[PDB]
Amino acid sequence: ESNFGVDFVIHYKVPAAERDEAEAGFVQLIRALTTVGLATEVRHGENESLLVFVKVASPDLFAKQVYRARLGDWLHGVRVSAPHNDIAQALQDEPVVEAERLRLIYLMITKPHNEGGAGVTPTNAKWKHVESIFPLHSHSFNKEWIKKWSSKYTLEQTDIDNIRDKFGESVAFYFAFLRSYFRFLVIPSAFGFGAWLLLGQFSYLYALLCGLWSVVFFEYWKKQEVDLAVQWGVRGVSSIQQSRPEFEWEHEAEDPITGEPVKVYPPMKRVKTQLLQIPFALACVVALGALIVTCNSLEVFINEVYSGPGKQYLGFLPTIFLVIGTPTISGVLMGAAEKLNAMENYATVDAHDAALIQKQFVLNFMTSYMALFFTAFVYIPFGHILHPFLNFWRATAQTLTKELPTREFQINPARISNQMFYFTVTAQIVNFATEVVVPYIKQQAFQKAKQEDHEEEAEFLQRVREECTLEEYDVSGDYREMVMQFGYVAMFSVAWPLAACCFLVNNWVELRSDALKIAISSRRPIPWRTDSIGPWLTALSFLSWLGSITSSAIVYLCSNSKSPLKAWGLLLSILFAEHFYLVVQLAVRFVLSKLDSPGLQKERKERFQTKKRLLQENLGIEHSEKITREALEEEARQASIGTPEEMFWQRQRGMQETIEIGRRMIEQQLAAG
Amino acid sequence: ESNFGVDFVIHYKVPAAERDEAEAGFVQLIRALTTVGLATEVRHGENESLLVFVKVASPDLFAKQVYRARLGDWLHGVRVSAPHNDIAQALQDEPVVEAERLRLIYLMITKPHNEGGAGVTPTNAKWKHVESIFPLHSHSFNKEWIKKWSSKYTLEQTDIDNIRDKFGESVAFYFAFLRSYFRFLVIPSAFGFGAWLLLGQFSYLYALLCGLWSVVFFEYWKKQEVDLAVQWGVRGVSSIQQSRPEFEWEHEAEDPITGEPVKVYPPMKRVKTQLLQIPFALACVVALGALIVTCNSLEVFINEVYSGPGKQYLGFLPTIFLVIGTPTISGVLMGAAEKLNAMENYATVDAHDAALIQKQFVLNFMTSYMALFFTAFVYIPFGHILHPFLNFWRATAQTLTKELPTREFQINPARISNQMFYFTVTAQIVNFATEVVVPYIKQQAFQKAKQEDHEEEAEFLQRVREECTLEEYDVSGDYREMVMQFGYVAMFSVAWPLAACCFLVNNWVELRSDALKIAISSRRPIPWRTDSIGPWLTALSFLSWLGSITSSAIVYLCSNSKSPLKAWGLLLSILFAEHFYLVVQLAVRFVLSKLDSPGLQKERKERFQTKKRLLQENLGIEHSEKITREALEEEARQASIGTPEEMFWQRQRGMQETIEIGRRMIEQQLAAG
Ligand SMILES: [Ca+2]
Ligand SMILES: [Ca+2]
Ligand SMILES: [Ca+2]
Ligand SMILES: [Ca+2]
């Protein structure tokens, strides 16, 4: 039914040929683990492997290792609350959760062996045969988790705080971002259903309301992110996570924050190499932008200028030419993104994978909006610039198949509504069939491909050999869906104002669809820590900025197709609705700064009560005669040896002499006049 | 020669008629001071007043009052360094400076009498007769300060750190802003003398270089401001300064940061009233903007369309009509700014005077740039819109003085060079005669208007009666010059690129001119504390933003007067050179974040060494048998009562059994195939 107390499982693939270092490396693995302090087992693998099963042996030593890592966080400003002074009592105050238990075990297994437990890092390449280090699922918990989340309409902060406890924080920021995005998507579904009903399409009032929402939501998430990063105690872990073994370093100095010597790469040698992605991000706009346009210039040739045979047969020819082409060019540019990401020499492993996202955001910008930036800006306002393109495909179809019958070219203004219907209805359904249904069918193809084991543990070992074949849950992958989906709302939703009503329905499925993908279709992720969503905050801030320029260039260029377009009107329509974005950015950033922040106030209270605790530890008529005694003493100590200095103060000592000379000098100053 | 140890001097004006409450209030003053712990004297005033002379009586009580206010700052996160544990030894570690001595005396004199010393606040209105509370100058220090600062070309950080020690921090941020602005003004004086020599006037390359500098300088000052606010220990005093007696409050709760009960005004009731200055800032643009234009539309009538008598006599008629008018309309709008500033109900006294600046920035924007916004944008590009204006002053001059001889109207493109020559050369000289020379002459008019005193202190009392007549140094006043002077560099310097070469010469005088104004022409200011320059950071950030729009609309509208102007070219010239400002804002904000910050690292080191001090106080082969002993114990404690759980771990205990079954299960898995 349940796991047998098993913390982690290491796979350790052994090949038939070249088993000479796999057998001796198994000795080098199974005895390196026991020096850390964790017991082991070995069972039969799937075909040709050795699942070893580790658990921490003595909890009286592990309870001292949680406390040694709780103080290690609290010294670094991560935890706002200090642990309790009595050892083995702070665990009774706050328990150890299943995320903090598996994280410190994984830091014991993966470490450079000089500062922690051991190294079973697969990138060390001496442990080449170590295939996967993964924790087991809790199938009595996943059965309740899908049941509890499907029997409720809205979620609750307590229902995310038990995803923090078991799947770490890096997973539980996604479900806390998706909940705080499905609830903010009611607001463009409020007036978006309004401006589809009352106003016409391409309404300027909706293009301002959806510029206000995209900065109300984004600046409220940054205020909700430092409330979760305090309450979960994950406040600023960007400088704490373990460095990389491939981190080359120029020289080694001392850390001015801490004192311990660290490896130092000079940052102005890194900004010179980080600058080199400006010709990269221009090259990805050029390369992938030339494929989507050439595919769409052919797709407008088959549909709009054609009369020959097979209009529906040849209509699927561009879409085949895209989905074969677009992973080939993306695979080449990722070969240039990866060979540039190692050249930038990132220190922490969390800031190396968070720069592979910003170098893959440009590849996943052009593949999702150049199909719409070509329709809304080139095709629908002034599409007669395509006559070089539509004469090329005539001359491409003359030499292949007599004159081919081609009709006259006419701009169809419904192409912006057909393409937004695909990206908001069809490409959300077929994404749901790809996310959930297709891997759920793929286990039946593993069922077709189905061993001297023991009969007591036979049901449990049948599950672990099944669980090894699944892929690790890439939580950066599901952020990429909910940020591109933010793009169609911020940028292109003015062209189809129901596009927030068919994402609110999809996100409420996606809040449970992605919860299904953790349970049945992926192994349990290693519980990492993040303080933010990462490099998506610079991707939500870019689409929300662009979503005030292209959501107002659409409402000018495309509304006149339902007068000539003049260039002074467009550049004024950009200038007002981008400055309105920058003004309402400054209004929301000023209003939310005036609100009560229960994250920093929980932090700045414990910082104050630390010093007030430190203060009370070390520090545990009658005043007028103190005035007189020191005044006569100053004359007494200068009576031995002055004349213009201390004889100035001794004339009016005390106060009763002072009011006497004070009152006598009032009539003496007023009887003269 | 020097003051006789006198800390402060209270003036206490007493009138002839209504002396009934001045005599009894003098008793209520001179005995309220002695309950605090400071000695007093009374001497003859100037004509009809009573200068009382206070000093702290016993330094053994004052040394405990500095320490009670050093811990009061360190508990609030102001001071990054805790004081020494031994009492009367932290004064030997760091001494008490003359700014921190006079500040705690002024907090003893001015306080609500329930939490501190006493109340001699003149706004209490029971101490109505108390005129001025001021500390005396050190005329042996001012003689060296002008000598040391005039005998050097460049200044030094040590030469500002002894202005922190004696004139407080609120003065010494001005001299540290003026030094960090005169040194950054070399850079537009570098290529500004270049682009005046090499390129022509209205050069677009200078309009980008002066948009880059205005964000390099502004984002380097914000990095230099948290380096001074740590080193001087003034880190974040915005929530520490004393509240106002006129602060009305709705209810009283507890402070979540501290715990002590405070008076609470709900901030969303304040943002509703702070929003009301948007019709105010529109009204100041309308009111003062209609005076400067009507004055300039008359000034272009006398100079450009006129042939009658007295062209130089009538030419000074608009400038007389401005300098009489513009303080009358400004005095009315400040009557509306002050009656709105009390309606916003600010808590601290430092945030009440820092919102009177932002409500006087609009009055001091239009009075300094509407003379140039009318020339550069209305007169010089397309000035034939002034023909309604230039026909009005014809009909105004027909009915006053036969037909008047008027010549033909022609646009003179040298008006942008004549007006920038006034604002950069003439209005800096005549500002220097107004700042220094005119008050230095005004003491000779006090010498013409020149008493039963004592002959020993007669030279000292002759100086204090002279020093009472001076005005308090308003350090907000000299910021207003160096921010308007930043405006002509950021906005209008592209029209006259030598305008940075005649401000670099002026600032090097102003760095010593304003140092002369503290010594001889103003009394010593009370040493307050600020963490920033205040509301000028939102005024430098606005002029540097506007200085990428109007410094690029000038270079398009005015360069063609040396082709027709098209509106699509202007809105594109704004859109590129404002987005270039927002891009180079993001480059400088990212580069300077990667640099080493010695302010926060001095703060985040002492915060770490506090907890490491707190940690060491309370906390002051062989491992494989610990694995074995707990594994046999877990079977031992379950031997009494399981079968699928603990009998899973006991099969391979230790590690030598594990490699034995591990190696035997390698050939058993590979001899089958
Ligand atoms: Ca989906
Ligand atoms: Ca997803
Ligand atoms: Ca001046
Ligand atoms: Ca000045």
Residue numbers in the entry:
A (entry chain B), B (entry chain A): 15 to 415, 419 to 467, 476 to 587, 595 to 652, 664 to 684, 688 to 719
Authors' text:
First structural insight into lipid scrambling was provided from the X-ray structure of the fungal protein from Nectria haematococca, termed nhTMEM16. This protein is part of the TMEM16 family, which encompasses calcium-activated ion channels and lipid scramblases with a conserved molecular architecture. As common for the family, nhTMEM16 is a homodimer with subunits containing a cytoplasmic domain and a transmembrane unit composed of 10 membrane-spanning segments. The lipid permeation path is defined by a structural entity termed the ‘subunit cavity’, which is located at the periphery of each subunit. The ‘subunit cavity’ is believed to provide a pathway for the polar moieties of lipids across the membrane, whereas the apolar acyl chains remain embedded in the hydrophobic core of the bilayer.
For the structural characterization of nhTMEM16, we have initially studied Ca2+-bound and Ca2+-free samples in detergent by cryo-EM. By this approach, we have obtained two datasets of high quality and of sufficient resolution (i.e. 3.6 Å for Ca2+-bound and 3.7 Å for Ca2+-free conditions) for a detailed interpretation by an atomic model. In the structure determined in the presence of Ca2+, we find a conformation of the protein, which closely resembles the X-ray structure with a root mean square deviation (RMSD) of Cα atoms of 0.66 Å between the two structures. The high similarity prevails irrespective of the absence of crystal packing interactions and despite of the fact that the sample used for cryo-EM was only briefly exposed to Ca2+ at a comparably low (i.e. 300 µM) concentration, whereas for the X-ray structure, the protein was exposed to Ca2+ during purification and crystallization at a 10-fold higher concentration. Cryo-EM density at the conserved Ca2+-binding site, contained within each subunit of the homodimer, clearly indicates the presence of two bound Ca2+ ions located at the position originally identified in the X-ray structure. Instead, it is likely a consequence of experimental conditions, which stabilize the observed conformation of the protein. This is in accordance with residual density from the headgroup of a bound detergent molecule at the upper part of the lipid translocation path found in both datasets, which might prevent subunit cavity closure. The Ca2+-bound conformation in detergent and the ‘open’ class observed in the data of Ca2+-bound protein in nanodiscs both show the widest opening of the subunit cavity and thus likely depict a scrambling-competent state of the protein. In this open state, α-helices 4 and 6 are separated from each other on their entire length framing the two opposite edges of a semicircular polar furrow that is exposed to the lipid bilayer. On the opposite border of the subunit cavity, α6 is immobilized in its position by the bound Ca2+ ions, which results in a tight interaction with α7 and α8.
